[PDB]
Symmetry: D2
């Protein structure tokens, strides 16, 4: 799989488990169409979202349902979600890890792109 | 102004100057309607986007054009932009973003 | 003042108020000598730690007492403190720290 | 191993490879004594620093030589290093991952503590 999503919890110091993740691809009509989704595992990781065959160059959106996660922990959050929007680029083989570190009023995201 | 946006550059250790910022508000038909826009100043700050009267309850999206920023510095970054989406239930909101080519962070400082 | 420290709370979305900050400078014998200290204000900012004349070239450590901050809020955090160690080769330095119980970030904004 | 260190590069979007990492334990004389060290792998990870037998409750410092890393990339950095100082706590089994995300003028660190 060319795309992994990993979510961590900065309040509890733990993987963020059972977080819903939705991936969209930008369509020619310039709207976001759903592509793949899942929930993070006990390790905070979400594997198997797509395939090398399916994950062609394009503009993608990864939406992480952070609000439902904090609501389940009883902590008032600021953001409705975390979005990561990026253009994929075939240039040799590549794997993308989208990692997000969550706090109730802050999040960070980084992309680790490896061969 | 109840909303201010501050953008910093974690590569240069400087304010991120002249960054385009667009604010949208979700309408009754669930579409994103344009609300306000501007550019960050020499201090990295964008003041005066809206007023207390205009900034009613609702769901807002702040879109920071980080890609154009990095490309102007010769860097091809990962993200198309940095988004912040939030509900206002009411206060002053500062939306701060810290930028690197393959990472960004955003935090909200909400004071009264 | 050439050095200002700003501390924010990523759980509450607020400035981190009354946080203790200690600054050290490395001496010729490679020991850390105390240089200045203070507490963050209601804005999360600590101004006036030093002066242009006192803040000479050298290696500095800013130690932010994040543990006492979280414990006062009922949280047992991971880190004993947040450190920033840097060389001044000269300018205004803003050292900003964003705090969560098991994570912190720090950035330097260096302007002229 | 109860302690892992992982370092990522936010400029290149990659693991931070060959970064030196030094671990110290606070001694009774209240000075930092070296305990373990190594360099990050191609995955940005440093495994095998210590053992469950050796890693007793105490105050630890993890020092990451970020300055040498940025100097090797030709990018002027702000920090001399990144330090993570923490007290370990036996409370059921525990593994600590200390993760650091590096930029030339900024770094973040988080602890992922799992069973
Ligand atoms: C934005 C951000 C900053 C730090 C982390 C972070 O702590 C982390 C931890 C891991 O175990 C790990 O494998 C990765 N990774 O490979 O992306 C990141 C995660 C996200
Ligand atoms: C996500 C993140 C992390 C760190 C910063 C940050 O470093 C920062 C720096 C400032 O000078 C400053 O005035 C503020 N602020 O007002 O909140 C934040 C900004 C954003």
């Amino acid at each position: 799989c060319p795309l992994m999503v990993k979510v961590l919890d900065a309040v509890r110091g733990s993987p963020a488990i059972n977080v819903a993740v939705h991936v969209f691809r930008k369509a020619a009509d310039d709207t976001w169409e759903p592509f793949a989704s899942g929930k993070t595992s006990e390790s905070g990781e979400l594997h198997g979202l797509t395939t090398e065959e399916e994950f062609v160059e394009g503009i993608y959106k990864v939406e992480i349902d952070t609000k439902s996660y904090w609501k389940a922990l009883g902590i008032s959050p600021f953001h409705e979600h975390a979005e990561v929007v990026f253009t994929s680029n075939d240039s040799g083989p590549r794997r993308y890890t989208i990692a997000a570190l969550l706090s109730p009023y802050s999040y960070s995201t980084t992309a680790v792109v490896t061969n």
